[PDB]
Amino acid sequence: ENPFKEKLLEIMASIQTYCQKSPMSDFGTQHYEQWAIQMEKKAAKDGNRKDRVCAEHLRKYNEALQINDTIRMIDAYSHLETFYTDEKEKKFAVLNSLKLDETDEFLMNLFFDNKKMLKKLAENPKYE
């Protein structure tokens, strides 16, 4: 049971807890991607920022699991690192809380608290 994949699954479960969602779709599937898209879409339509941003982030983790299955661990890690590095750049690069609310801080801290561990696992030839 690959520890890298297990860590990603645990993180998605933690995000689902935060936004109180519990879809029947399995993590890392196309059907999960579709659930997240609908939820993101309904959230934007209903002005629910927490749900919308959580759906967006869950999509990225779901895509990383799909990338892990079809390519390599390191492409999966990079998919997330790039997204979170960019989100960080978006948030703090230009300054006119600002764009950082409790949802944003929860999600970014969730990734960056696990970032070092994830990279260690993804760099390990044994689980590839």
Side-chain angles (χ1 to χ4, degrees), residues 2-6 8-94 96 100-115 117-128:
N2 178 17
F4 174 77
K5 174 178 178 175
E6 187 53 45
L8 295 186
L9 299 175
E10 292 176 345
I11 295 177
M12 296 184 67
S14 287
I15 300 182
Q16 292 199 162
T17 304
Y18 185 81
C19 61
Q20 288 174 287
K21 302 301 176 170
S22 181
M24 287 305 276
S25 295
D26 296 317
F27 291 144
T29 61
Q30 171 56 27
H31 270 80
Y32 187 95
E33 186 78 0
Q34 291 167 207
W35 167 85
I37 290 170
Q38 276 187 284
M39 197 264 278
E40 181 172 19
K41 181 164 57 73
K42 177 190 177 178
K45 200 174 181 181
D46 299 344
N48 196 322
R49 183 182 191 283
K50 173 173 116 298
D51 285 352
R52 177 183 62 78
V53 179
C54 278
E56 165 187 7
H57 287 231
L58 285 161
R59 281 181 66 192
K60 289 283 160 285
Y61 278 95
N62 188 68
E63 292 156 13
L65 283 168
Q66 292 175 307
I67 293 174
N68 177 62
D69 281 339
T70 57
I71 309 181
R72 304 286 190 264
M73 280 188 305
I74 190 69
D75 295 87
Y77 168 82
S78 157
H79 189 69
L80 286 161
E81 198 279 336
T82 297
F83 169 69
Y84 279 105
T85 292
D86 293 343
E87 284 293 292
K88 201 183 181 193
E89 184 179 19
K90 262 189 293 195
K91 261 49 189 169
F92 297 118
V94 168
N96 15 333
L100 218 58
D101 59 12
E102 294 182 331
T103 297
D104 287 332
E105 115 175 11
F106 169 81
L107 294 170
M108 301 195 70
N109 280 313
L110 189 55
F111 174 72
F112 288 108
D113 281 341
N114 291 279
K115 175 165 134 59
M117 180 166 145
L118 284 175
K119 187 182 166 49
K120 280 204 186 186
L121 296 173
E123 287 290 4
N124 190 349
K126 172 171 187 167
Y127 309 111
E128 189 55 75

